[PDB]
Write an enzyme that holds these catalytic residues in place. Structure first.
Site, PDB file in Angstrom:
ATOM      1  N   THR A  87       0.761  -1.255  -0.016  1.00 22.97           N
ATOM      2  CA  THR A  87       0.112  -0.020  -0.065  1.00 22.97           C
ATOM      3  C   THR A  87       0.897   1.345   0.027  1.00 22.97           C
ATOM      4  OG1 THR A  87      -1.820  -1.085   0.810  1.00 22.97           O
ATOM      5  CG2 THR A  87      -1.791   1.219   1.260  1.00 22.97           C
TER       6      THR A  87
ATOM      7  N   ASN B 172       6.154  -2.190   3.370  1.00 24.23           N
ATOM      8  CA  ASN B 172       5.170  -1.680   4.552  1.00 24.23           C
ATOM      9  C   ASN B 172       5.788  -2.016   5.788  1.00 24.23           C
ATOM     10  OD1 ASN B 172       2.899  -0.806   3.505  1.00 24.23           O
ATOM     11  ND2 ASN B 172       1.918  -2.960   3.669  1.00 24.23           N
TER      12      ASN B 172
ATOM     13  N   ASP C 252      -4.274   1.195  -6.010  1.00 21.06           N
ATOM     14  CA  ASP C 252      -2.971   1.157  -5.551  1.00 21.06           C
ATOM     15  C   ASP C 252      -2.296  -0.489  -6.126  1.00 21.06           C
ATOM     16  OD1 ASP C 252      -4.249  -0.343  -3.460  1.00 21.06           O
ATOM     17  OD2 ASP C 252      -3.351   0.845  -1.888  1.00 21.06           O
ATOM     18  N   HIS C 253      -3.250  -1.260  -5.655  1.00 22.83           N
ATOM     19  CA  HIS C 253      -2.889  -2.657  -6.095  1.00 22.83           C
ATOM     20  C   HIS C 253      -3.984  -3.455  -6.098  1.00 22.83           C
ATOM     21  CE1 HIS C 253      -3.624  -3.268  -1.827  1.00 22.83           C
ATOM     22  NE2 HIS C 253      -2.443  -2.406  -1.573  1.00 22.83           N
TER      23      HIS C 253
ATOM     24  N   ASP D  71      25.885  -3.363 -15.048  1.00 19.77           N
ATOM     25  CA  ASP D  71      25.132  -2.568 -13.684  1.00 19.77           C
ATOM     26  C   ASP D  71      25.729  -3.346 -12.564  1.00 19.77           C
ATOM     27  OD1 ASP D  71      23.724  -0.705 -12.379  1.00 19.77           O
ATOM     28  OD2 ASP D  71      21.690  -1.890 -12.695  1.00 19.77           O
TER      29      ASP D  71
ATOM     30  N   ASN E 231      26.486  -1.909  -9.913  1.00 20.67           N
ATOM     31  CA  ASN E 231      26.259  -1.050  -8.623  1.00 20.67           C
ATOM     32  C   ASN E 231      24.660  -1.144  -8.516  1.00 20.67           C
ATOM     33  OD1 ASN E 231      25.454   0.720 -10.510  1.00 20.67           O
ATOM     34  ND2 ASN E 231      26.525   2.507  -9.328  1.00 20.67           N
TER      35      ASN E 231
ATOM     36  N   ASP F 203      22.018   0.082 -10.129  1.00 15.73           N
ATOM     37  CA  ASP F 203      21.184   1.142  -9.901  1.00 15.73           C
ATOM     38  C   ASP F 203      20.293   1.457 -11.078  1.00 15.73           C
ATOM     39  OD1 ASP F 203      22.933   2.009 -11.769  1.00 15.73           O
ATOM     40  OD2 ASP F 203      23.803   3.848 -10.789  1.00 15.73           O
TER      41      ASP F 203
ATOM     42  N   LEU G 128      21.395   1.946 -14.254  1.00 12.35           N
ATOM     43  CA  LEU G 128      21.711   2.696 -15.013  1.00 12.35           C
ATOM     44  C   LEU G 128      22.973   2.179 -15.187  1.00 12.35           C
ATOM     45  CD1 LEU G 128      21.385   6.099 -12.492  1.00 12.35           C
ATOM     46  CD2 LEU G 128      19.734   5.184 -14.437  1.00 12.35           C
TER      47      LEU G 128
ATOM     48  N   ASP H 205      26.631   1.544 -16.357  1.00 15.11           N
ATOM     49  CA  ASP H 205      27.992   1.684 -15.514  1.00 15.11           C
ATOM     50  C   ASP H 205      29.090   2.618 -16.320  1.00 15.11           C
ATOM     51  OD1 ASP H 205      27.057   0.265 -13.411  1.00 15.11           O
ATOM     52  OD2 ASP H 205      28.361  -1.477 -13.791  1.00 15.11           O
TER      53      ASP H 205
END
Ligand SMILES: *[C@@H]1O[C@H](CO)[C@@H](O[C@@H]2O[C@H](CO)[C@@H](O[C@@H]3O[C@H](CO[C@H]4O[C@H](CO)[C@@H](O)[C@H](O[C@H]5O[C@H](CO)[C@@H](O)[C@H](O)[C@@H]5O[C@H]5O[C@H](CO)[C@@H](O)[C@H](O)[C@@H]5O)[C@@H]4O)[C@@H](O)[C@H](O[C@H]4O[C@H](CO)[C@@H](O)[C@H](O)[C@@H]4O[C@H]4O[C@H](CO)[C@@H](O)[C@H](O)[C@@H]4O)[C@@H]3O)[C@H](O)[C@H]2NC(C)=O)[C@H](O)[C@H]1NC(C)=O
Ligand SMILES: CCOc1cc(C#N)ccc1COC(=O)N1C[C@@H]2CN(C(=O)c3ccc4[nH]nnc4c3)C[C@H]2C1
Ligand SMILES: [Ca+2]
Ligand SMILES: [Cl-]
Ligand SMILES: [K+]
Ligand code: NA
Ligand SMILES: [Zn+2]
Length: 806
Positions: free
Chosen positions: A159, A180, A308-309, A683, A685, A687, A689, A691
């Site tokens: 949630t 949660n 939400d789900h 990748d 690390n 992230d 994105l 490297d």
């Protein structure tokens, strides 16, 4: 401590948190134990209920009433929502024919159409069809406005992560609400659902919509609602705010319903007890729309109906216990339920070993209902790794199941019949989206999209500049009548070199050999043409990818494929080739099994070498353009160039060979030709994105050949499959994957069987959006098509999920 001696007289649901120390009167005061003594008395009136009755019409104003049916109520902004229906012979909004809202029809002094976000907890996507008979208001919104068949939540499908993703456009890993329940090692603090710590600002990263609005001079209603404030009062409060003077009136509002989630947990997603919660939400929507209509706002406000789900069938008996797997079960802390996260109970325990834990949890029982992962090996599409609050060890739990530490946890913490939290591709977890109002389209269905995209759109609806986020701005322009955001393609940063033949065979000392010494300007002028790009319109269908960072790379042309070869990473960034429906699959000839050939366009110093692969006992190699799909015996030699080679673990070559030998042909056959772009991803690390070179943690031994963490492929064809992939006049169809480059196949419990029983299932699990690959490679795809850029952005955010129909 709060000195609550002040009064809420005239301050009920005030839009400022008062100067400390002071008495409070806002939606959050209950949570803080800070409400004035008279808050309940003045601000939570219930007398007479929520509806006007005929006898109340024109009544003398009695302030004790929860809402009013007096003649002055429209001016005071506080009629019961059904006032004009009962007292003025008006009709309910739901009974009115829907009529296109071409332009906003707003009262004077409204500077912009307001946005109302009506969010519903656990509203499973299939409720729209399955509950449609008991939701006339929601059904009118849906059929008359813009709707998707479903909306994809983020992982974990819990949630707080999803509501805060809705508000920020960020992945949980980036906004920081990663479940949660959370532990932050840096803060040495814990986040619990029950308590006080959850309000502390340090948990909540990014910039939620109410803050974006505020900082840009757009006033927001308060997004949080105390659980004990009934829905009817929530609606009346929003309606009252909408009657405030121009300089005080917010432009963006939120409503939140705990239903149907609350009942869904107790009774399951389709329990007979679920009908009533759905009726009730609809009645609330009706109250809102009637109330807007009274204020002449029902053709002014944009309303977003969003979940939400979803919710899945889950029961106590469907729980896996870690004590059936680990002998050391008390040395761990487990965050349990529909996902699992494991850390050491004590950091002074130097006998804690994640690797033996993972191994003890790997493929141990035949029907095992969870799979362990190091978080960086999770499918990249989940984007669930780059946060210190996410434990290194993770359990992906099968739909319908729970994981727990010991049986005692389940009976001394069945109570529940529904839960959510599972993988966000799971059908039962899908949720809803409807947009209705002047800025949304009229009676329009749009394809499923991800909830991370909405923040941008909500910013567009409010004239706001969105904070940096994970949406692709413009990918949802097709939902809007106006307010579209017109993005331009990012500029290419590095331009390629186009190398000709510059090196002699003998300049290379690569320890590679090949049985290629086998010998007419007929097929000699022809092979020159192929190296100049004569077939490039066939194999490069959407233009070359743009390289969006500073690097040094070469375009290399061949009969069967084109590549963008990185002189920095010593391999292609991308390899593009087209396989028609008619293409034939051949084998690698006996004499050519180990063949690797120098590329006379590329220097020895910017090439890989076979020696490093010989000395490296762990690492073998594969090819990006597959030799099996070569168009002729002569063309096949091209597939063996050292510039088409990439480092591959033997275990991963199992996966890759099957994809290249079997699946590409199968796709071309089913899709009427495919264009394929494959390449490496680095990748380390985790992230999400690309490297930089100094981030690479592994090389082929005794070389500067970097080891990818993943291999991707983007597989494009014509949406109208009656047209071949290379002659498509209209919209495209894409599926993509980002396969983890692992030295073992531990993730696939069936991997000792033939590839035909496990490889494709692995690939499906690691399905990806083209956009995911863009982040991971710094490449920009589809630069040259006949399609509008917004349509291309939508295509780039598409995810092929492999679930059956909703
Ligand atoms: C999805 O979209 C999001 C949003 O666009 C993308 O995330 C962005 O990515 C950027 C690139 O990684 C990143 O930029 C970095 O910012 C650093 C400072 O940032 C702070 O300020 C911003 C702006 O207000 C704020 O948003 C940040 O908030 C983070 O941290 C707090 C506290 O933990 C959290 O409350 C919040 O949730 C958020 O946490 C998340 O992000 C951080 C990373 O910042 C993660 O660690 C967390 O796990 C979590 O996911 C920050 O408060 C800045 O320092 C960086 O600059 C370094 O590198 C550049 C190179 O260009 C260099 O110029 C600098 O000198 C610097 O190097 C120095 O630091 C290095 C590391 O300490 C060190 O090694 C060097 O030696 C140097 O000393 C960098 O610019 C940006 O912060 C986030 N934004 C958000 C909201 O997360 C995300 O990438 C997208 N995802 C995908 C898959 O596309
Ligand atoms: C945090 C961002 O909040 C928004 C963003 C948007 C947007 N966009 C719109 C509305 C909002 C407004 O949220 C709210 O008022 N709240 C109050 C509710 C208390 N809470 C829970 O205790 C809870 C916990 C675990 C659960 N499992 N299953 N159900 C659960 C419910 C969920 C919170 C939502
Ligand atoms: Ca990276
Ligand atoms: Cl959680
Ligand atoms: K080797
Ligand atoms: Na295996
Ligand atoms: Zn729930």
């Amino acid at each position: 401590w709060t000195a609550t001696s002040g009064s809420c007289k005239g301050r009920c649901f005030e839009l400022q948190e008062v100067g400390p120390p002071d008495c409070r009167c806002d939606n959050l005061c209950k949570s803080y134990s800070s409400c004035c003594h008279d808050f309940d008395e003045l601000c939570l009136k219930t007398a007479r209920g929520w509806e006007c009755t005929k006898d109340r019409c024109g009544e003398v104003r009695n302030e004790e009433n929860a809402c009013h049916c007096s003649e002055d109520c429209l001016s005071r902004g506080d009629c019961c929502t059904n006032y004009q229906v009962v007292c003025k012979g008006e009709s309910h909004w739901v009974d009115d024919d829907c009529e296109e809202i071409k332009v906003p029809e707003c009262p004077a002094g409204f500077v912009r159409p307001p946005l109302i976000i009506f969010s519903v907890d656990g509203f499973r996507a299939s409720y729209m069809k399955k509950g449609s008979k008991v939701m006339p208001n929601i059904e009118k919104l849906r059929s008359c406005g813009t709707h998707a068949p479903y909306m994809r939540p983020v992982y974990p499908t819990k949630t707080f992560p999803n509501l805060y993703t809705l508000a920020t456009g960020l992945y949980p890993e980036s906004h920081g609400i990663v479940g949660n329940s959370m532990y932050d090692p840096v803060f040495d603090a814990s986040f619990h659902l029950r308590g006080r710590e959850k309000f502390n600002h340090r948990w909540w990263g990014g910039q939620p919509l109410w803050i974006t609005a505020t900082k840009q001079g757009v006033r927001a209603g308060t997004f949080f609602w105390s659980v004990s404030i009934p829905h009817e009062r929530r609606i009346l409060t929003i309606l009252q705010w909408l009657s405030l003077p121009d300089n005080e009136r917010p432009s963006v509002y939120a409503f939140y319903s705990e239903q149907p989630d609350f009942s869904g947990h107790k009774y399951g997603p389709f329990g007979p007890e679920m009908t009533n919660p759905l009726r009730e939400i609809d009645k609330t929507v009706g109250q809102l729309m009637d109330g807007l209509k009274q204020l002449r706002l029902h053709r002014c406000v944009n309303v977003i109906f969003v979940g939400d789900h979803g919710m899945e069938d889950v029961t106590c008996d469907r729980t896996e216990f870690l004590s059936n797997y680990l002998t050391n079960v008390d040395d761990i802390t487990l965050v349990p339920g529909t996902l699992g996260r494991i850390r050491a109970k004590s950091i002074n325990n130097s006998k804690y070993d994640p690797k033996t834990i993972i191994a003890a949890l790997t493929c141990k029982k035949p029907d095992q209902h969870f799979k362990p992962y190091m978080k960086q090996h999770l499918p990249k599409r989940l984007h669930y790794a780059n946060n210190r609050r996410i434990e290194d060890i993770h359990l992906l739990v099968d739909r319908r199941w729970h994981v727990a530490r010991k049986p005692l946890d389940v009976y001394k913490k069945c109570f529940f019949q529904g839960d959510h939290g599972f993988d966000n591709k799971v059908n039962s977890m899908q949720t809803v989206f409807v947009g209705y109002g002047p800025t949304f389209k009229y009676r329009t269905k749009v394809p499923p999209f991800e909830n991370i995209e909405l923040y941008n759109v909500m910013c567009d609806l409010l004239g706001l500049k969105p904070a940096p986020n994970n949406g692709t701005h413009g990918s949802l322009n097709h939902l809007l009548r106006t307010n579209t955001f017109r993005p331009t393609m990012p500029d290419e940063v590095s331009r390629p070199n186009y190398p000709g033949i510059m090196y002699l065979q003998s300049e290379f000392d690569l320890g590679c050999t090949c049985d290629d010494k086998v010998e007419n300007k007929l097929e000699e002028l022809n092979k020159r043409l192929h190296t100049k790009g004569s077939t490039k319109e066939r194999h490069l269908l959407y233009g070359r990818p743009a390289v969006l960072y500073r690097t040094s790379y070469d375009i290399l042309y061949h009969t069967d494929f084109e590549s963008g070869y990185s002189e920095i990473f010593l391999m292609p960034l991308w390899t593009s080739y087209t396989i028609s429906k008619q293409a034939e699959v051949s084998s690698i000839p006996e004499h050519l099994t180990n063949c690797v050939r120098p590329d006379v366009r590329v220097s020895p110093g910017f090439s890989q070498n076979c020696l490093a692969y010989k000395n490296d006992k762990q690492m073998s190699y594969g090819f990006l353009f597959p030799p099996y799909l070569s168009s002729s015996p002569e063309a096949k030699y091209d597939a063996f160039l050292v510039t088409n080679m990439v480092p591959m673990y033997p275990a991963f070559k199992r996966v890759w060979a099957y994809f290249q030998r079997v699946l590409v042909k199968k796709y071309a056959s089913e899709r009427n030709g495919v264009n394929v772009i494959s390449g490496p991803i680095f990748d380390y690390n985790y992230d999400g994105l690309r490297d930089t070179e100094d981030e690479i943690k592994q090389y082929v031994e005794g070389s500067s050949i970097p080891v990818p963490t993943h291999y991707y492929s983007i597989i494009t064809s014509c949406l109208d499959f009656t047209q071949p992939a290379d002659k498509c006049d209209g919209p495209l169809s894409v599926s993509s994957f980002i396969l983890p480059h692992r030295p073992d196949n531990d993730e696939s419990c069936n991997s000792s069987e033939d590839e035909s029983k496990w490889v494709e299932e692995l690939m499906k699990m690691h399905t990806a959006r083209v956009r995911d690959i863009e982040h991971l490679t710094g490449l920009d795809f589809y630069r040259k098509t006949s399609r509008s850029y917004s349509e291309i952005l939508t295509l780039k955010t598409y995810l092929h999920t492999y679930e059956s129909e909703i």
